Every structure is written in C-alpha cells, then in structure tokens.
Amino acid sequence: LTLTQSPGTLSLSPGERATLSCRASQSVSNNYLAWYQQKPGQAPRLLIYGASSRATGIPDRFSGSGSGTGFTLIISRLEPEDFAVYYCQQYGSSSITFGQGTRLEIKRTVAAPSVFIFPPSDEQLKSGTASVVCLLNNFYREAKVQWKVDNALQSGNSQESVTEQDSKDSTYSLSSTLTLSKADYEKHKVYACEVTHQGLSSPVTKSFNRG
Amino acid sequence: DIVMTQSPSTLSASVGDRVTISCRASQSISSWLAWYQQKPGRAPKLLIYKASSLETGVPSRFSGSGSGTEFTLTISSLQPDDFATYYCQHYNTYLFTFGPGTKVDLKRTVAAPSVFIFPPSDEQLKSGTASVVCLLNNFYPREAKVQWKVDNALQSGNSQESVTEQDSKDSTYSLSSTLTLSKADYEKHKVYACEVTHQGLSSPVTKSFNRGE
Amino acid sequence: QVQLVQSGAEVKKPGSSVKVSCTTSGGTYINYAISWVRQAPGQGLEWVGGMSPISNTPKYAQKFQGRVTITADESTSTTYMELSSLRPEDTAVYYCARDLLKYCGGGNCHSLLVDPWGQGTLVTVSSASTKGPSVFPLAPSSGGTAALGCLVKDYFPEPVTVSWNSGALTSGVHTFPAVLQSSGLYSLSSVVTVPSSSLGTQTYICNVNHKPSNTKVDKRVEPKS
Amino acid sequence: QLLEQSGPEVKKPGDSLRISCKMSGDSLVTTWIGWVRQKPGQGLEWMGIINPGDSSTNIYPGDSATRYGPSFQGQVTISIDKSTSTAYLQWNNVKASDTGIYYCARHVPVPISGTFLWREREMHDFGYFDDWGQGTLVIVSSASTKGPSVFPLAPSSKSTSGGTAALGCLVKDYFPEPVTVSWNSGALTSGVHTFPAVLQSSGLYSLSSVVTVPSSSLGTQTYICNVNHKPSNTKVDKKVEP
Amino acid sequence: HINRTALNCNDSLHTGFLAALFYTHKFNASGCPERMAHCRPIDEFAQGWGPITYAEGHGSDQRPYCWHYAPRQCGTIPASQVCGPVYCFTPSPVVVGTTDRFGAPTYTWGENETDVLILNNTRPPQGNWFGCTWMNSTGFTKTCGGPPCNIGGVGNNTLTCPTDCFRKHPEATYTKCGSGPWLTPRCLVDYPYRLWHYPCTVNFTIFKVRMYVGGVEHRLNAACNWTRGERCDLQDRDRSELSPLLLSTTEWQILPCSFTTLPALSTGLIHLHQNIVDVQYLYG
Amino acid sequence: YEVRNASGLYHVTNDCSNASIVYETTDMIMHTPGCVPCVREDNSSRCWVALTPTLAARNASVPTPRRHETVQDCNCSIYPGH
Ligand SMILES: *[C@@H]1O[C@H](CO)[C@@H](O[C@@H]2O[C@H](CO)[C@@H](O[C@@H]3O[C@H](CO)[C@@H](O)[C@H](O)[C@@H]3O)[C@H](O)[C@H]2NC(C)=O)[C@H](O)[C@H]1NC(C)=O
Ligand SMILES: *[C@@H]1O[C@H](CO)[C@@H](O[C@@H]2O[C@H](CO)[C@@H](O[C@@H]3O[C@H](CO)[C@@H](O)[C@H](O)[C@@H]3O)[C@H](O)[C@H]2NC(C)=O)[C@H](O)[C@H]1NC(C)=O
Ligand SMILES: *[C@@H]1O[C@H](CO)[C@@H](O[C@@H]2O[C@H](CO)[C@@H](O[C@@H]3O[C@H](CO)[C@@H](O)[C@H](O)[C@@H]3O)[C@H](O)[C@H]2NC(C)=O)[C@H](O)[C@H]1NC(C)=O
Ligand SMILES: *[C@@H]1O[C@H](CO)[C@@H](O[C@@H]2O[C@H](CO)[C@@H](O[C@@H]3O[C@H](CO)[C@@H](O)[C@H](O)[C@@H]3O)[C@H](O)[C@H]2NC(C)=O)[C@H](O)[C@H]1NC(C)=O
Ligand SMILES: *[C@@H]1O[C@H](CO)[C@@H](O[C@@H]2O[C@H](CO)[C@@H](O[C@@H]3O[C@H](CO)[C@@H](O)[C@H](O)[C@@H]3O)[C@H](O)[C@H]2NC(C)=O)[C@H](O)[C@H]1NC(C)=O
Ligand SMILES: *[C@@H]1O[C@H](CO)[C@@H](O[C@@H]2O[C@H](CO)[C@@H](O[C@@H]3O[C@H](CO)[C@@H](O)[C@H](O)[C@@H]3O)[C@H](O)[C@H]2NC(C)=O)[C@H](O)[C@H]1NC(C)=O
Ligand SMILES: *[C@@H]1O[C@H](CO)[C@@H](O[C@@H]2O[C@H](CO)[C@@H](O)[C@H](O)[C@H]2NC(C)=O)[C@H](O)[C@H]1NC(C)=O
Ligand SMILES: *[C@@H]1O[C@H](CO)[C@@H](O[C@@H]2O[C@H](CO)[C@@H](O)[C@H](O)[C@H]2NC(C)=O)[C@H](O)[C@H]1NC(C)=O
Ligand SMILES: *[C@@H]1O[C@H](CO)[C@@H](O)[C@H](O)[C@H]1NC(C)=O
Ligand SMILES: *[C@@H]1O[C@H](CO)[C@@H](O)[C@H](O)[C@H]1NC(C)=O
Ligand SMILES: *[C@@H]1O[C@H](CO)[C@@H](O)[C@H](O)[C@H]1NC(C)=O
Ligand SMILES: *[C@@H]1O[C@H](CO)[C@@H](O)[C@H](O)[C@H]1NC(C)=O
Ligand SMILES: *[C@@H]1O[C@H](CO)[C@@H](O)[C@H](O)[C@H]1NC(C)=O
Ligand SMILES: *[C@@H]1O[C@H](CO)[C@@H](O)[C@H](O)[C@H]1NC(C)=O
C-alpha cells in the first residue's frame, strides 16, 4: 500500500533510454504490479502486468523488471507519442492502490518569456469588480509571477492558470488573474507585474497607471 | 399491585448502636427482595438480595433477614459510613419497585431553634410582589412546625420553605420559610409574625416585625 | 472494571421530547442490557424502564406505557431512551445501570440492578429561559452573635455558587437548597452566623455567580436600622 | 474495447444520480466490470468491483460480489443487469466534491496463490483492468445553468510586442462546461492559446483565449470570437477592436 | 432448559457469563491474546524415546482451555458446583444429566444435596467416554479425563500428551492417549455451547469428519483453528487418524494441515497436496 | 507410512527405513509393501522408481547381501500433484 515513485517529472529527448521506478512501503507478493499509460484527454491503457510481461500491441521499447520492493519501467527509445503520465498499480492481497503519477516532458533549450498585462475592461469595472491579467507565454517552465499594486506586494488574491506542453515549440504559458474590487482599483494608481525566471538574468517588470 | 412501605420514616441512633429497619409488602413475596443504600447526591449501591444473602465487598456487619411479608435490615454496630437512606426494593421478571426510603442519622440532645425574621427587601416590593422570609436556625430534631401570622390572622397555602441537610459538626438543622403575598396585600396589613413550635422549646416562640421597620 | 457513561446535561421546554443515552466500556462481553431509574428531587427512586436481558423486549413501568420508548444498537453497545409530553414534574436525575442476572435457580432466574451506575444526567423541564438573579441584601437587625445573608432570587437554570468575602468567610455559612417556584423559576437563601461586634467593621459581600447566564453579582450588605 | 456510456450530465447537489455503462460485446458472462474515478488535477483511484459470476468465485473472503473501495461503502452502489446486458452505478445523495470522470474496465482477476481449503479453491483476487473506454463527466454545484459573459480583451500598444500584438476574448460567469471558442471566427491560428476553464470564487467558471496577431492584420482584417455555451443554449459572437 | 439439568450458580464477579446461557452476546475479543499467552505450540517441547505407560494424576492446577492440559481421573462430583449442562463426551459430543446418590434419575432442578453427578470414565470401545468439560458455579471451565500418557523425554520439558500428538512420539494416538475434546493439537470437537466454555474459539472453521473407534460409527463437526498463509511444510502435519469422507471422486476430507493413516486407493502411499492443505489424494 | 527421527521432530515420509529392507542385489531391490526406498551413491541420491508394489529399479531400459546404502533424508512420491 501507499505506493510511491520518483522523480515527479522527467525531461528527455526522443530515441533515448529512460527509467521509471515506483517504490512500495511493503514489497508485493509474487511480484504483483502493473503500469498504465494515459495520453492527455484519452482513456489510459495497460502496458505491463507482473512487472515483466507485456500486454498485446506493445512495442519492445516498453519493458520492466524487478521484484520485492524494487521495480522499474524501461523505455528502449523515447518517441513523440511516448510522452504521457504513468501509474503503477500495486495489487494482490485483497487490495489495490495506484501511484501518484509521473509525466514525461521534452528537454529543449531554455526560452525567455514575454510579459504582458491587460487593464480591466470598462464593462468589467462597471460591474463593480476589476480583473487584471498578466499574460506570460513562450518560455521555460517553473517560473513565478509577482504582483505590486502601487508599490505594494499582493498575496492570496491572484489566480494563475497554466498551459499544456506545445506540440511544436514545446513551451508553456500562464495567465495570472488578479481579482480586486472597483473600489480597490480606484484606491490605487500604479499597478505592476513582475516575473522571476531561471533563464532571466533579472526580473522584468511591466506596469501601468490607472486611467 | 405491589406497594412497599417502610416504618419509621426516619431513624436515629449513635455510633456503635444497634438499629433495625422494617420493610413490608402488600402481598406475600417468598424471598424476592433487595436493599439498596443510596448516599445523598450519589449513585445507589446494592447490599443484599434474597432477603438474607450478603453482597461481595459488603462488610459482614450488615445482616438482613425475614421472609413472607415483613423483612428487616438490622445493623449490629453503626459506622460513619452508615448514615444514608436504604430503599428496600422488590424485583421480579417484569417490573421493579422501590419503597419510600428510610433515613438514619446521629442522635443528639434536643436544641432549640433561633428564630429570625427579615422583612421583604424594597427592591422586590417595587417589583409588585411581597415575600416575607422566615428563618429557623440550629435546631434538633428535624421535626418542627412553623406558622404565619399577619395582624394576628392565620395563613395557609401561600408559603414555601427549604430544609438543609443535617449539620456535620453541631448535628442540628436550619430552616427558612417564605410567605408569598401580593404587594397590595402586603400594604394592606400592619403586623407580621411567625409562630414556631419545637420540642426543645417549652412554649412556641413568636418573632414579629412592623411594616417599614 | 466496566464503565458506564451517560450523555450530558440537558434542558428542554414542556411538551417536547428528550433523548438520553449511555454506553458501556471495558466489559468481558460486548452488549449489556441497560435499565434506567428516575428520582424526583427530594423523593424516593422510581424505575422507568429498560431492556430485559431474557428476551431483549423492552419493558416499561405501567405508568410510562407509550409515553416512553427504549431502543438500542449492537454496534456501539449503546442504549437509547426518548420521552414524550414532558410535564414540569419530570425534572430529575436519570441513572442507567446494567440488568445483570446474578441469582439463578428454581425453574427461573432473577435479574438485578448491579453496580456500577452511570454518573447521572439532569433534565430541567421548564418553559423559562436563561435569566440572571436579583440580589438583595439581607441586612441584619442582637446578642453576642448576628445572623445575616445575601438573598438571591429569580435565577435559572442551576447551579449558583455564592462565596462570602471571596471565600475568606466560610465559618457558619449555611447554603440552602434551591427550590422550584410556581413561575418556573428558582430561589435561594444563604445565612451565616457572625459576631455582632464585627458587623460594622469587616467587609460583608456575597459573590453571587450564575454560570448559565455568565452573570457575576457582588452585592454589599450593611446592618439594618 | 467494448464500452459506451451516457454523455456528460449536470445535476444539483443532494440528488439521486444514475449512470449506465453498456458493453458493445453485450455478453456480460465472464466480464468483471470495474469502476475507476479520476477527478481532474490528481491521479486516479479505484472505486469498486462487481462480479457477474455466482458465489463460486467472488473474492478471498467469499462475501458479496460487489466489494467496494476503501472509502466508498454505502456512499456508492454498484449494480449490474445481466438480463438486459447493461451496467450501472446506482447513486444516492450527491455531494459537491464528486466532480470528475467515471470509467469502466474488464478487470480479469488473478487466481489465488498460497494456502486454501478445497472449498475455497478458485477464489480470485484483484489486479487487472485491461481495456478501458471513453468516459463520462458528472459536474454538480449549487450554481445553476447560465450564459457566458464575453468581454473583449482590447489590444493596445502596451500589449503589442514587435509585429505581433496580444489580444483575445475573456469569458466569465458561466456554467456548466464546456464552452467551445472559435477565436477570430474563420481566421488562421498561429500561436493562439486557449487555457482550460478555472473555478474562480463564488463557484463560477472562467476561461480566457489569447491570440498573437500581426499589427497590420488588426487594421486590415477583423476579429470576432464565436462562443457556443451549449449547456445553457446561449450562443454569442463578440468582436474585438482597438 | 430441562428439569434434569443443574443450574446452581452465583455470578459473584458480576461478569454476566450466565446471560450467554439464555441470549447470545458477543465476546470481547481483545482479551484473547493474553488469555492464550501460555498455550505453547507442539513444536517447542521435549522428545519421547522410550516405552509409554498410562501416566499418573498430574495435579498442577493448570489452565483448562489450553490443548495440552493434563486432566485427572475423576468421578462423582457434588451437584452444587456445576452450572449449565455438563458435556462429557464420547468422540461425539453427548450429555449426561444429574442423577441420584446411586444413579437413579432425578428431577429436582439440581437444588438438593442428594442430587450428584457420576463421571466414572474409561476408554472406549469397552468404556464410556474420554473426558468431561463443564463450567462450575462461579464461571470457570473445569475438565476431567482418563490418565494422560508419560511420553518421557530428557529435561524438564516433558509433555504428557492429553491428545493425539503423533509428533514427539510416533506411537501416541487418540484412541490410546486421548483425554478430552482436542482431536489434534489444532482442532476441537463442536457442541452447541462450545463458544461458552471455551470463550473465543469463535473464528475456527468447521469441517465434516467421521471416525472409527472399535468398529463403530461417528460423525464429528470438528472446529479446527486456521489462518491463510501459515507455513505447512511437510514437517508440520499431525496424524489425525480417521475414516475419510470421500469429498470428491479422487480426494478425501482431512483436517487442515494434517494427514490421516490409510493406504492409497491403489498402488500408492500417502499423497498430500502442496497448496490445498486439507486434501489427501486417494491414489495420486 | 514411515517416519524420520531428526532435528528434534517426527514427520511422515515415504522412504523405506533399514528395518524395512531385507534382500538387495546389484541393481534389483525388493522391499516390504508400503514404502519406496532410495540409495546414497556417488554423491547422487535418486528416487528408486518402483514398477510394482514390491519391486523397484533406477532405470528400466536394460531390465526391460549388504551392497547398497540407503538413507532417510529422501523425499520421493511425497506430495505428487496428480
Ligand atoms: C473490549 O476489551 C478491551 C480490553 O480492555 C476494552 O478496552 C479497554 O477499555 C477500558 C474501558 O474504557 C479502558 O479502561 C480505561 O482506562 C483509562 C486509563 O488508561 C481510564 O481513564 C478509563 O476511565 C478506563 O477505565 C482500557 O484502557 C481499554 N484497554 C485498551 C487496551 O484500550 C474495550 O473497551 C472492550 N470493549 C467493549 C465494547 O467492552
Ligand atoms: C490459532 O492459531 C494461531 C496461529 O497459529 C494462534 O496464534 C498464535 O498464538 C501463539 C500463542 O500465544 C502466539 O505465540 C506468542 O508469540 C509471542 C511473540 O510474538 C510470545 O511472546 C508469546 O509468549 C507466544 O509464544 C503466536 O504469536 C500467535 N500467532 C499469531 C499469528 O497471532 C492462536 O493462538 C490459535 N488459537 C486461537 C484460538 O486463535
Ligand atoms: C529419536 O532421536 C532422538 C534424538 O537423537 C533420540 O533421543 C535419544 O535417545 C537415546 C536412547 O533412548 C537416549 O539415550 C539415553 O540417555 C539417557 C541419559 O540421558 C540414558 O540414561 C539412557 O540409558 C540412554 O542412553 C538419548 O538421551 C536421547 N537424546 C535426547 C532425547 O536428546 C531417540 O532415542 C530416537 N528415537 C527413535 C525411536 O529413533
Ligand atoms: C469454580 O472454579 C474456580 C476455578 O478453579 C474456583 O476458583 C479457584 O478457587 C480456588 C479455591 O477456592 C482458589 O485457590 C486459592 O487461590 C488463592 C489465590 O486467589 C490462594 O491464595 C489460595 O491459597 C488458594 O490456592 C483459586 O485461586 C481460584 N481460582 C482463581 C482465583 O482463578 C472457584 O472457587 C470454583 N467455585 C466453586 C464454588 O467451587
Ligand atoms: C476473530 O476474527 C475477528 C474478525 O477479524 C477479529 O476481530 C477483529 O480484530 C482486529 C484486531 O484487533 C480488529 O482490527 C482492529 O480494529 C481497531 C479498531 O476497532 C484498530 O484500532 C486496530 O488497530 C485493529 O485494526 C478488527 O476491527 C476486528 N473485527 C471485528 C469485526 O471485530 C477477532 O480478533 C478474531 N479473534 C480471534 C481470537 O482470532
Ligand atoms: C524433504 O522434506 C523434509 C520435510 O520438511 C524437509 O525437511 C526440512 O527442510 C527444511 C529446508 O532445509 C529445513 O529448514 C531448515 O531449518 C533450519 C533451522 O532448524 C535452518 O537453519 C535451515 O537453513 C533450513 O531453513 C527443515 O528444518 C527440515 N525439517 C526437518 C524436520 O528436518 C527437507 O528439506 C526436504 N528435502 C528435500 C530434498 O526435498
Ligand atoms: C454465591 O457465591 C459466592 C461466591 O463466593 C459466595 O460468596 C462467598 O460467600 C461466603 C459466605 O458469606 C463468604 O465466606 C465468601 O468470602 C464469599 N466469597 C467471596 C469471593 O466473596 C456467596 O455467598 C454465594 N451466595 C449464595 C446465596 O449462594
Ligand atoms: C466413580 O468415581 C468416584 C470418585 O473417585 C468413586 O468414589 C470413590 O469410591 C471409593 C470406593 O468406593 C472410595 O474409597 C473413595 O473415597 C470414593 N471417592 C470419593 C471422592 O468419594 C466411585 O467409586 C467411582 N465409581 C465406582 C462405581 O467405583
Ligand atoms: C503452491 O503455491 C505456491 C504459491 O504461489 C506456488 O509457488 C507453487 O507453485 C504451488 N504449487 C505448485 C505445485 O504449483
Ligand atoms: C419434568 O420434565 C418432563 C419433560 O420435560 C415432564 O414430563 C415432567 O412432568 C417434569 N416434571 C416436573 C416439572 O416435576
Ligand atoms: C431432596 O431429596 C430428598 C430425597 O431425594 C427429599 O426427601 C427432599 O425433600 C429433597 N429436598 C428438596 C428441597 O427438594
Ligand atoms: C527447565 O529449567 C531451566 C533452568 O532453570 C529453565 O530455563 C526452563 O525454562 C525449564 N523448563 C521448564 C519447562 O520448566
Ligand atoms: C540408466 O541410465 C543412467 C544414466 O545414463 C545410467 O547411469 C544407468 O546405469 C542406467 N541403468 C540401467 C539399468 O540401464
Ligand atoms: C542402512 O544400511 C546401510 C548399509 O550398511 C548403511 O550405509 C546405512 O547407514 C544404514 N542406515 C541406517 C539408518 O542405519
């Protein structure tokens, strides 16, 4: 029970040897274990049962081996369709559980971001509330955006969204939406958006003044 | 039905004395009986069953007996832990039944009460109600009578009183009786008095006050 | 070693129904038949009803038929008793104790209420609501000793704790049991015996306290005219 | 792969739901229909197993043939209708936190290994799910069906980066999902990003669509966002201009 | 509930054991891991190596629920020390009621000095029954039985088997060394009140077995301990000599993780299955 | 059925004991009905296959005084599934 796996995320390139191991607190008897593959927006399908036997319609690239508390999933060479989330499903002993999950990414060169900001719409303000969104796209993931309302940092009042990996460019994109009432918007004049990125030497700040 | 009664209503003795309690039923019961000791304010306990058998952990001093209709829970020697009330109980397949209950207390020389009367406070009179408070203090035995007098007139059915548990040290009792009357009725009379009759008192003692005093 | 634990204290208004439960613990067996008893204040006990340990079909006293139902569950070893049409005189403390077969023989075998008993749960069937007291001074009027007090009236629900001089004066203090008034409210009287020489020199104060209303009253008493 | 299911359903909280999982094979004689729930944002988790077979197989204990998950006893009911050749997930007392997907699987079990009497032979154990199929969507919340609020994300020189500017259409205050967005109507798509719907405060849904377009095209051609809120039947077509 | 069954008893400890006689009540299971903390396994003991003789009265006031309890020759017992029916059983559970001073039947509900029980026991086939078991007035199990055996051995770990312990003495057997219910070191006999006298032998699985002692028929509902995953290598099998029940076409019903003593159906030795513990193949 | 006295235990086994063997030859071994012997040889202990309840051999190809040494650590026909 309480199956676990590492690492949380991977970043590889097509045609390369890959390893994926999920560890159990207690070793399952008779090497009872099976992996699953879930392409985005699709029904997950079966790969391996028994930790060594391969199911039908599976290329020889995907295989696994081990016993006791140790297990591993082995990809001979990554392919464009091989990127997905994998779950190992410990079973037997009148109980079955699932692993957390592990996603495959594409390890490409670091890309710098583009910072954008949209002041709230006039109709939105007429509604009594303001929604300023700072848009970020075409960059390298694992970043963080900051908020400053008239040289005052904000926390607990912004909602962020993320984009899935692009098919061609392989980049990410965010939409950090900061929610504030019309009265709060009028209480302050200067509004700024700042982002911290690994690939950026210094953070980039984009700001605008009310009205 | 089955009605269990005890006699006397209260009992008195001193440490080391021999006391007897009587529990009798309306219809003959072979041996189905049991006596519970109920401390005041605590949970009751079992003492004997079958009218003769002791209960585990009960000191052998307690010794019940009897059969048929009359029974008894006789104690050879009293102890400081014996001062309680014993509810002679009957049991059967369907129902249970309890008796009114007997009380056993210390024996002490008679003591006269100290009667005090407190006229009603102005605050409650302003509320439209009059409640004369009548007090008896440090008396023994429990049995005593109190009467009300207003302008020498008798009163009944319009007073309430409270009784305290026996004093642990002086082995006396205290009593307070309150006479409830309307403000208009209170202002309609001049003299208020309590008449108290007690065994240790040779003659009843009357404590009285005048309105506005 | 078996421990019986009841529910908490309860307050309700006349005409409603009250449900009381108690659970056994630490017994060699799982489910014990539980029988309840009742005593009106200042009165001999009275047997309400309970679960027969011979057939488990609940049996009530002849004066509670219908008015009271008894149900129990085997999962938690808990027993339930609910009332109906509470009259004001049902105010009492309710005990639950095991109905254990101890003596046996003669073509039949008789059960008994056996130690231990539950702690006790108090139900106060009155129509009044939380009200604070009305403290008045029982100003003394003789001799070598003087009697005075602090009259506390019109308070509900119980209890009320009264301390003289914040507990400094505890010799001769007589606290009287509370009584149920005709109005659904409660009264009190407290008197202490003290020497007359100290009537006009030592501070005399009654720490009137009422937890249900969270009202603290500290009235001052002076000798009367 | 034999699985057909009712499309997405939207239900009020605290209602009696019901969802059927028919098998195209129409032979539920040796099929162990499973039930795996997977709410968005985290991994999936097993819910229950139903055996069409007799008591001969069941599971190790030999109890009922509908052994449930670790925290789904009573709160779910799983049933089969072999005569009608249909499955079901007979529900009761919907909660607000049961949004997600509900799958079906064949789940051919694993034979018993170890020690057992002659009576307890052939007593399978869990372990497979094999081929899955499509899925369903149950979404329940206090909010009622409402139309979308489309606000133009007005382009500006502030939002302009080089030749390609930044703009889009903001959609907010709608339920239930989905809202199909065709940004710029019949316009070529190049870098357009449509982020997934997000549950904001007050139990409401919002979605944004952003497209990067040349500055000249803005003045020489028009942009209209086409939104079809099918669940509320509301269909709107909003245009974005400087 | 017949008028020939003694019922004299005092629930003096207020433990409510007498209730289970009338209406069943679940037994608190959390106490068993302590109650059976001195029921040592058959594996950890001494080894007999010499001639075996009917042993002598073993008086050590041991606990009567463990299987290796060594009962003593008994007989007449006063009728004021037995509550509930007394089960003293031939290999099949049978009950003996209260009798008079000299064996004549009595119908006094056991509430009389004259009434007494007689338990003069000798081994079958020529005897009457192996051992007795009942619960006395205050609620403690008591047992009787014919002399156990003196297995012998070296050291202070002598066994004195009260039952059929093939291990530690290949010649020990039930019909010649049995005392009480335990057919083997694992399995009891089953009678209506088994859950009463032996408190928490309640998870035992029940098996259908039939036995022959001196050319007579017997049907036993043996209720024998178990649990899955327990090692049952070949050195963990006790001889439960008995007549099998012909469970299937070519299989026999045997007590769990044990074996019986009979030649194969044809040209074969004992053939035990590796995983299905309670089956011995006829021919293999 | 025979027994094996070793390691402080008694457990059943099918290999014949020395008391159950009477006559032996170079390759032909006979035994009392009710067990199947085996022989320790050249650090190899093989189960002597039996062709009748009384006769046994090691190898039926060619065939179709104290000379041999047996042993009681021999699991033969001991738990044969079907
Ligand atoms: C079934 O038997 C077990 C074994 O005793 C019972 O658990 C035991 O229950 C008793 C009663 O609650 C516990 O005693 C408690 O001790 C604490 C001090 O440690 C004391 O503060 C409590 O007032 C009470 O006396 C005892 O600790 C507990 N034992 C364990 C190991 O948990 C269980 O309650 C029984 N079940 C039933 C339904 O009777
Ligand atoms: C039924 O069979 C089971 C298992 O065969 C019995 O449980 C076992 O009981 C023995 C006797 O106490 C346990 O041995 C104990 O081991 C501890 C150390 O763990 C030691 O300190 C004690 O002195 C004692 O030797 C043994 O652990 C236990 N096994 C398991 C798996 O719980 C059971 O008693 C049998 N009878 C019944 C009625 O269940
Ligand atoms: C089964 O194997 C056991 C263990 O090898 C044998 O136990 C041993 O048996 C011999 C013969 O009886 C014992 O020798 C005796 O020693 C005592 C002194 O302790 C002496 O007084 C006797 O005259 C005799 O020499 C030996 O002690 C004993 N060893 C143990 C029990 O550890 C057993 O005899 C074998 N039985 C069979 C049937 O094969
Ligand atoms: C019913 O059977 C039980 C179980 O044997 C009897 O309880 C046992 O009674 C004997 C003697 O009456 C006790 O022996 C004494 O033990 C104490 C220690 O508690 C010791 O100080 C004495 O010297 C003597 O050896 C024995 O302990 C006791 N068993 C216990 C407490 O587990 C019971 O008396 C029988 N009932 C009747 C009516 O005979
Ligand atoms: C006979 O079988 C029953 C059924 O399994 C056994 O009762 C079970 O005993 C286990 C062990 O204590 C219980 O699990 C425990 O649950 C408590 C919470 O109640 C938890 O705190 C412990 O950590 C442990 O997980 C289980 O609930 C209980 N089941 C039932 C239905 O009572 C019983 O012990 C067995 N008795 C013998 C003598 O083998
Ligand atoms: C033939 O069948 C017998 C009957 O079980 C087997 O005897 C047992 O063999 C096991 C495996 O070696 C022995 O386990 C051993 O335990 C000791 C601890 O005493 C440990 O140190 C060893 O490493 C090993 O695990 C077991 O003791 C033994 N039983 C007896 C009574 O001697 C035998 O192994 C089987 N042989 C073949 C070739 O099939
Ligand atoms: C019921 O059995 C109990 C079990 O002991 C008896 O309790 C004993 O009574 C005798 C006589 O008073 C005492 O000397 C013993 O000390 C008691 N034993 C214990 C452990 O306290 C009880 O007397 C019996 N009652 C009836 C009516 O038979
Ligand atoms: C059944 O067993 C009882 C108990 O041992 C026997 O009673 C004994 O009889 C002998 C001889 O008559 C006496 O010396 C003993 O004192 C008796 N024992 C007791 C405890 O009283 C009885 O004799 C046996 N039955 C028969 C038929 O012999
Ligand atoms: C008996 O069960 C075990 C446990 O899985 C297995 O390894 C073994 O192969 C089984 N026996 C046979 C003869 O297959
Ligand atoms: C005793 O029971 C038997 C059968 O139950 C009956 O025939 C007989 O009359 C009974 N004798 C009594 C109760 O004295
Ligand atoms: C006990 O039995 C004797 C004779 O067996 C008889 O005389 C006596 O009346 C009986 N006593 C009781 C109480 O039954
Ligand atoms: C035998 O004596 C030894 C030495 O004191 C001791 O360790 C062992 O436990 C004893 N065995 C028994 C069964 O009493
Ligand atoms: C049987 O074959 C073995 C292996 O070749 C050989 O050693 C042995 O001598 C043969 N025995 C007979 C009787 O043919
Ligand atoms: C049986 O006899 C053979 C031949 O002498 C010998 O090698 C072997 O050790 C004997 N076995 C036993 C158990 O005595």
Residue numbers in the entry:
A (entry chain B): 2 to 27, 27A, 28 to 211
B (entry chain L): 1 to 213
C (entry chain H): 1 to 52, 52A, 53 to 82, 82A, 82B, 82C, 83 to 100, 100A, ...
D (entry chain C): 3 to 6, 6A, 7 to 52, 52A, 52B, 52C, 52D, 52E, ...
E (entry chain E): 421 to 704
F (entry chain A): 192 to 255, 295 to 312
Authors' description from the paper:
The membrane-associated E1E2 surface glycoprotein of HCV is the main target of neutralizing antibodies during infection and is of central focus for vaccine development.
Here, we describe a 3.65 Å resolution cryo-EM structure of a coiled coil-scaffolded sE1E2 heterodimer, sE1E2.SYNZIP (or sE1E2.SZ for short), of genotype 1b in complex with neutralizing antibodies AR4A, HEPC74, and IGH520. The primary map enabled the determination of a structural model of the sE1E2.SZ complex that included E2 residues 421–704, E1 residues 192–255 and 295–312, and bound Fabs HEPC74 and AR4A. No inter-subunit disulfide bonds were observed, nor were higher-order oligomeric states of E1E2. Interactions between AR4A and E2 were predominantly mediated by the AR4A HCDR3 loop, which accounted for 89% of the 673 Å2 of buried surface that made up the antibody paratope. Examination of AR4A interactions with E2 in greater detail revealed that a continuous stretch of residues at the apex of the AR4A HCDR3 inserted into a shallow surface cleft formed by two loops of the E2 bridging domain, spanning residues 646–652 and 693–699. Two highly conserved E1 N-linked glycans at positions N196 and N305 contributed to the E1E2 interface and collectively accounted for 295 Å2 of the buried interface, or 28% of the total interface. AR4A targets the E2 bridging domain and back layer while HEPC74 targets the E2 neutralizing face and prevents CD81 receptor recognition.
